[PDB]
């Protein structure tokens, strides 16, 4: 159906991406947390404590937008806000780190098998090959 | 990277964030971010749509796009409207200003996601990637 016809690289990305939102929102529904409340855990946890500033930066949503999530996430009790030595600083919770965890555990198994059921072993190699060749 | 085994999942993550970030570079002489150009474009191709429904179609919060659609109001490119039973659509500006987008990025932004690729690899992962989505 698709194979028919030319589409941008940008609109692929777009659309594969938003394809594995939906399984992310799937799969992590058993831990109540949805893919939007996931990435913004990650990105928190893989920089330690971070700039709500920065985390706009690095997440490229709109700077309220997050507020307000950082709200949310705060009340759930995975996040918190500190002063930073100069401002306000964000990061995990230990209930954070471990939803984080259980999160990324329950949910990698699961993402690879539905997102490469199409695929052969070396065409999954060969995609992945050449997605890192777009990144320099 | 080209030492690393890395989970699919994170490497469209990760090329998706660089094309936001191109798509933001390349759309600011037209003051608009790439979050505003592509609910300009989702409202487009539906020509229009319930917030409900645009929520669903985009898979951000219902918050953070009553929020989006209010600046968009007053940037005077979206509409609300009561339908026959809210429904938000382009105005002229809105519809013109998502043409000017689209034909000024596309040229540039493929080009800068292809520059390290040959002809035939951009056709592979185009393929691969069509295949990823049934």
Same mark, same amino acid.
């Given at each position: ?52 500033? &920065? /985390?706009? #930066?690095? %997440?490229?949503? +709109?700077?309220? $937008?997050?507020?307000?999530? *950082?709200?949310?996430? =705060? ?38 098998? &539905? /997102?490469? #059921?199409? %695929?052969?072993? +070396?065409?999954? $190699?060969?995609?992945?090959? *050449?997605?890192?060749? =777009?990144?320099?």
């Amino acid at each position: 159906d698709l194979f028919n016809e030319i589409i941008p690289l940008g609109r692929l990305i777009h659309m594969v991406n938003q394809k594995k939102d939906r399984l992310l929102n799937e799969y992590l529904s058993p831990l109540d947390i949805t893919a939007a409340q996931f990435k913004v855990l990650s990105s928190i946890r893989s920089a330690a404590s971070i700039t709500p500033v &920065e /985390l706009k #930066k690095v %997440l490229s949503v +709109d700077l309220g $937008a997050l507020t307000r999530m *950082l709200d949310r996430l =705060v009340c759930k009790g995975w996040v918190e806000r500190l002063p930073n030595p100069n401002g306000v600083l964000v990061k995990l919770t230990t209930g954070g780190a471990a939803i984080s965890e259980q999160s990324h555990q329950l949910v990698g198994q699961d993402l690879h098998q &539905e /997102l490469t #059921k199409n %695929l052969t072993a +070396d065409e999954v $190699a060969t995609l992945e090959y *050449l997605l890192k060749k =777009v990144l320099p």
